[PDB]
């Protein structure tokens, strides 16, 4: 009577699958089992992203998942984690969950159209900066964000929250990443009160 449903997750290490299965087993025990039975399909990260996209299509072909969870890779480069699943298992508009995605360029509902995250992005840490600033007797800020999407959006959020207080950022000094000669910007920031 309870129709079998598959909820899948890709996550590093073999051990993580054990509590994946344990947690999905615990979840159904909280409710009855005469209505729905919960299953799980798991896989582990691998370098070539094309292979991950192919395996994602093969899994959703073989599992017709209700929701897919995506993890971070243990091989640094903390940008290629939700590359394959965001747009491969997104053509059918199926919910996708990420746990550790502190990067914010995935929050725009114009490219992904299906993404839910359990960690706040860096614009919220900019809001935290504002809250710290609110009562500390500091009102003469100098932003030094880097020219990138991970920083430009934070700068825009910081600006739009500050203008609500009728205050302004004096400077928007902004240097490109990678280049290592940046001294004149500090001198520019030096010549102010």
């Amino acid at each position: 009577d309870p129709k079998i449903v598959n909820i899948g997750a890709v996550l590093s290490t073999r051990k993580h699958e054990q509590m994946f299965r344990e947690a999905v087993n615990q979840a159904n025990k909280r409710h009855g089992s005469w209505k729905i039975q919960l299953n799980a399909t798991s896989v582990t990260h691998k370098p070539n992203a094309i292979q991950m996209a192919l395996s994602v299509c093969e899994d959703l072909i073989s599992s017709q998942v209700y929701a897919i969870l995506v993890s971070h890779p243990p091989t640094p480069n903390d940008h290629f984690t939700p590359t394959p699943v965001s747009y491969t298992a997104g053509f059918y508009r199926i919910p996708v969950l990420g746990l550790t995605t502190r990067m914010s360029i995935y929050s725009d509902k114009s490219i992904h159209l299906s993404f839910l995250r359990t960690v706040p992005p860096y614009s919220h840490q900019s809001s935290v900066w504002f809250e710290m600033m609110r009562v500390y007797s500091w009102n003469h800020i100098i932003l030094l964000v880097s020219d990138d999407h991970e920083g430009r959006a934070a700068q825009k959020r910081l600006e739009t929250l500050l203008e609500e207080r009728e205050s302004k950022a004096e400077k928007v000094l902004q240097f490109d990443p990678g280049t290592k000669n940046v001294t004149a910007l500090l001198m520019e920031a030096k010549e102010l009160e």
Partner: antibody
Amino acid sequence: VQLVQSGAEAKKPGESLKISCKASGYSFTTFWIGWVRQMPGSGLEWIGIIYPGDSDTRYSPSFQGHVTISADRSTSTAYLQWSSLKASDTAMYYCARSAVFDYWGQGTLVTVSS
Amino acid sequence: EIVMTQSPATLSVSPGGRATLSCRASQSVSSNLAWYQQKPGQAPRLLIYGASTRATGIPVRFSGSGSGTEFTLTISSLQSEDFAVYYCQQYNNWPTSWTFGQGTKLEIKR
């Protein structure tokens, strides 16, 4: 789905028995198995519900501390053992399936007569 | 702490007639109630879960309804071959209560 219970039996007062309800229709850890009693002219009364996958058990308020509800991990049989205090509990016990008595067993007629 | 009650007494009915007996709820169970039509000399069969739906493999000659009101039988245009016993139980929260009724047995009219 299927359910087979222990055979009917009669025992003298002041003895402890055991009846094994074995499920061979679904996985042994997917549902909450239980126990109900149907004495002639009384109705249905719950005794105890146990999950064989973790041995978590609960019992009825008006029966607690009178019989044990054990289980296993490979034979997939739940043992409803009684105590010597039973003297007028002759009935036809049944084991539930998914806490809503989905698929009942064949029934175990337990008699306590002199 | 709310024992389900079945009514009215005995409701033996003629062939080609409905069977509607009351299971007036004393508590405020959210949506759960069941009757579990049973035949003496056999095991009770699953008739309704959630007091509004019907399990797979069963026709639609018996049902139920209600969320805050008294969950009642919804049997109509039935035959006389059943003549079964009808208890009524519910599970407001599980597994704690397991409240059961006494059963309004139905005979066969002629």
